[PDB]
Design an enzyme around this catalytic site. Structure first.
Site, short mmCIF file in Angstrom:
data_model
loop_
_atom_site.label_atom_id
_atom_site.label_comp_id
_atom_site.label_asym_id
_atom_site.label_seq_id
_atom_site.Cartn_x
_atom_site.Cartn_y
_atom_site.Cartn_z
N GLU A 183 0.86 -1.21 0.00
CA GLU A 183 0.00 0.00 0.00
C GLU A 183 0.89 1.25 0.00
OE1 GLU A 183 -3.04 0.12 -0.58
OE2 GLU A 183 -3.99 -1.74 0.11
N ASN A 225 -8.01 7.74 -5.82
CA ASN A 225 -8.76 6.58 -6.36
C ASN A 225 -9.56 7.08 -7.58
OD1 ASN A 225 -9.35 5.82 -2.96
ND2 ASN A 225 -7.86 4.78 -4.26
N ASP A 283 -12.61 6.90 -8.16
CA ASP A 283 -13.92 7.49 -7.75
C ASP A 283 -13.72 8.90 -7.18
OD1 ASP A 283 -12.91 7.01 -5.20
OD2 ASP A 283 -14.73 6.07 -4.44
N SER A 294 -11.94 9.62 -4.46
CA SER A 294 -11.58 9.58 -3.03
C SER A 294 -10.06 9.52 -3.01
CB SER A 294 -12.23 8.43 -2.32
OG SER A 294 -11.79 7.21 -2.86
N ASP A 328 -6.61 7.73 -0.73
CA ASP A 328 -6.06 6.77 0.25
C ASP A 328 -4.90 7.45 0.98
OD1 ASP A 328 -7.81 4.79 -0.70
OD2 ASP A 328 -6.18 3.68 -1.75
N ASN A 361 -9.09 4.97 3.08
CA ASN A 361 -9.76 5.75 2.01
C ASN A 361 -10.78 6.71 2.63
OD1 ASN A 361 -12.65 4.99 1.50
ND2 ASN A 361 -11.71 2.95 1.29
N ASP A 398 -15.22 -4.88 9.70
CA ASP A 398 -16.42 -4.41 8.95
C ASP A 398 -17.16 -5.57 8.26
OD1 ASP A 398 -18.14 -2.17 8.06
OD2 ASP A 398 -17.27 -2.45 6.05
#
Ligand SMILES: [Cl-]
Ligand SMILES: [Cl-]
Ligand SMILES: [Cl-]
Ligand SMILES: [Cl-]
Ligand SMILES: [Cl-]
Ligand SMILES: [Cl-]
Ligand SMILES: [Cl-]
Length: 129
Positions: free
Chosen positions: A35, A46, A48, A50, A52, A59, A101
């Site tokens: 990462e 990202n 979309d 967003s 990280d 994110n 989650d």
């Protein structure tokens, strides 16, 4: 801060990630390598829109507030900038929420694609833990 491999393993262990939700320490070190390359200041946009942030590329779509991710949540109740600190506390505590989650470490696509099913113990080999 760019952590050394065993330095990060040590820090993650102290913060209680070793076998957290059944994920051995090597899984967390392997995820951090792919990462962030163990760099707390790592940021990546990202597709979309967003972003990280930090050692575990958490994110802004769900987990932290950066003020520029439309329709996003802040489930760790933290500014995303807190995830870039030399102190990994905020990254670790938020990662504990993420991995709890439902999908475990599959939340980290780099973990699924590059660590899952591999000899992750290699990532803590030689470390005084
Ligand atoms: Cl390394
Ligand atoms: Cl391990
Ligand atoms: Cl970080
Ligand atoms: Cl936002
Ligand atoms: Cl919004
Ligand atoms: Cl730390
Ligand atoms: Cl990947």
């Amino acid at each position: 801060k760019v952590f050394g491999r065993c330095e990060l393993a040590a820090a993650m262990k102290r913060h209680g990630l070793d076998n957290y939700r059944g994920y051995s320490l090597g899984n967390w070190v392997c995820a951090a390598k792919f990462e962030s390359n163990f760099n707390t200041q790592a940021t990546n946009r990202n597709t979309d829109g967003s972003t990280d942030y930090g050692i575990l590329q958490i994110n802004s779509r769900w987990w932290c507030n950066d003020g520029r991710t439309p329709g996003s949540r802040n489930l760790c109740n933290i500014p995303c900038s807190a995830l870039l600190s030399s102190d990994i506390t905020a990254s670790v505590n938020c990662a504990k929420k993420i991995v709890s989650d439902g999908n475990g470490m599959n939340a980290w696509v780099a973990w699924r694609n590059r660590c899952k099913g591999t000899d992750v113990q290699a990532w803590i080999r030689g470390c005084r833990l």
